[PDB]
Amino acid sequence: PQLEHVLNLRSMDYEDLAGVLSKISNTEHTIMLQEGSELWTTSIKAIHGVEIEESNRPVYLFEGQDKDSINAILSQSYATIRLQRGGDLIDYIVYKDKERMAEIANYYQNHYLDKIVVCNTGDIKNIRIDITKAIGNNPFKGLPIKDYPTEATYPATLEFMLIKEKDGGSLEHDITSQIQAVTTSLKFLIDSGFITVKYTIKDSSHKGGASDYEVSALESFQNYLRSWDEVKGQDKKPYILLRDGTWDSGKTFGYASGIGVIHLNNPRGNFEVAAISTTSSSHPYTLAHEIGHLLGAEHVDNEQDLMYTWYSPQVTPNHLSADNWVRMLECIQK
Ligand SMILES: [Zn+2]
Numbered sequence: 001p002q003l004e005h006v007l008n009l010r011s012m013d014y015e016d017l018a019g020v021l022s023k024i025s026n027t028e029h030t031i032m033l034q035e036g037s038e039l040w041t042t043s044i045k046a047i048h049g050v051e052i053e054e055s056n057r058p059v060y061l062f063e064g065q066d067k068d069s070i071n072a073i074l075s076q077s078y079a080t081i082r083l084q085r086g087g088d089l090i091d092y093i094v095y096k097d098k099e100r101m102a103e104i105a106n107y108y109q110n111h112y113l114d115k116i117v118v119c120n121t122g123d124i125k126n127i128r129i130d131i132t133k134a135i136g137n138n139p140f141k142g143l144p145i146k147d148y149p150t151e152a153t154y155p156a157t158l159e160f161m162l163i164k165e166k167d168g169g170s171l172e173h174d175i176t177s178q179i180q181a182v183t184t185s186l187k188f189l190i191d192s193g194f195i196t197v198k199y200t201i202k203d204s205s206h207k208g209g210a211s212d213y214e215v216s217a218l219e220s221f222q223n224y225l226r227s228w229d230e231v232k233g234q235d236k237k238p239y240i241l242l243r244d245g246t247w248d249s250g251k252t253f254g255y256a257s258g259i260g261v262i263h264l265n266n267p268r269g270n271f272e273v274a275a276i277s278t279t280s281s282s283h284p285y286t287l288a289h290e291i292g293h294l295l296g297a298e299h300v301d302n303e304q305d306l307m308y309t310w311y312s313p314q315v316t317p318n319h320l321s322a323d324n325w326v327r328m329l330e331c332i333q334k
Pocket of ligand 1: 146
C-alpha cells in the first residue's frame with residue numbers, strides 16, 4: 001500500500017538499516033517494523049535545517065511525523081533507530097565494521113551487564129539498549145543540577161564545534177544521539193527559519209582526568225582551544241568538550257561557561273563560549289541541556305522540561321518553558 005520498506009529489528013545489521021535510511025530524502029517514507037511477534041508501521045523523513053560533519057563526512061538525522069515518536073541516524077560507519085517500546089525509550093545500534101560493532105557491544109556489556117542490553121547475533125548484528133531502564137538505574141536522581149557559574153531571521157547559521165576529549169571514550173553514535181536531542185530542543189528556532197544548525201565533530205589531543213572538577217576542566221579546555229592551530233581563527237563559535245564519563249566523581253554531567261552567551265549578530269570571541277558534556281547513553285540530553293544554558297535557558301520546575309533543575313527520568317529534550325523561549329530569543333538576537 002503506502003509501505004516502502006520492511007525492517008526486522010531483531011535481525012537487522014548496518015546494511016539493512018542503512019539500506020532503508022539512505023533512500024529517504026524529501027518525502028515521508030513508511031516502514032513496516034518487526035520485533036518478534038510484533039509488527040507495526042511507522043513513517044519517518046529526513047530532518048532539514050541541520051548539518052553534521054563527522055570524520056569529514058555527512059551524518060543524517062531522521063524523525064517520525066506525528067505521534068510516531070521515532071528518530072534515526074545514518075552515518076557511513078553506523079546507524080541507529082530510537083523509538084518507544086512498551087513505554088520505554090529503546091536504542092537500536094548497528095555499526096558497519098564488525099570489529100567496531102564488537103567493541104561497542106563490549107562497552108555496553110561492561111557498563112550495564114530485565115534486559116537493559118540485548119545483543120542480537122547471527123557475529124553481532126545489532127545492539128538494543130533500553131535507555132529508560134539505563135536512566136532508572138542512575139544515582140543522584142533528585143539532586144540539584146549545578147552546571148553553570150554564578151553570575152536574526154536570516155536564517156543565521158549556528159555552528160557547534162564538538163570536540164572529542166582524547167581517550168575520553170565518547171562513542172560515535174552517542175555523540176550524534178546527543179546531537180539529535182539538541183536538534184529536537186531547537187526545532188522551534190529551526191522550523192521558523194530563525195537559525196540553521198551545523199554540528200562539527202572533531203578529534204583533539206586534549207586529555208582530562210576522570211574525577212576532575214568541572215570549573216578547572218572547562219578552563220583547561222578553553223586554554224587548549226586558544227593554542228590549537230586546528231581551530232585558529234574559529235574563536236567565535238560555541239565549543240563543547242565531549243567524554244563518555246563525568247566530572248567531580250560522578251556528580252557533574254555537564255558544565256557551561258555561562259548562561260545566555262551565544263549571540264548571532266555579535267558573537268563572543270576568544271573561545272569564551274564553551275561547555276563540557278558527557279555523551280553517555282545514561283545521560284541522553286545533557287548536551288542539549290548545556291547548550292540550552294549557553295543560549296539563555298534557565299532551570300525550571302517542570303520535570304518534563306529539558307531544563308529541569310533536578311536529575312529525573314521524566315525529562316524530555318524539549319524547551320517547554322515560555323520564559324526560556326523568551327530568554328533564548330532575546331539572547332541570540334544580540
Ligand atoms: Zn543546568
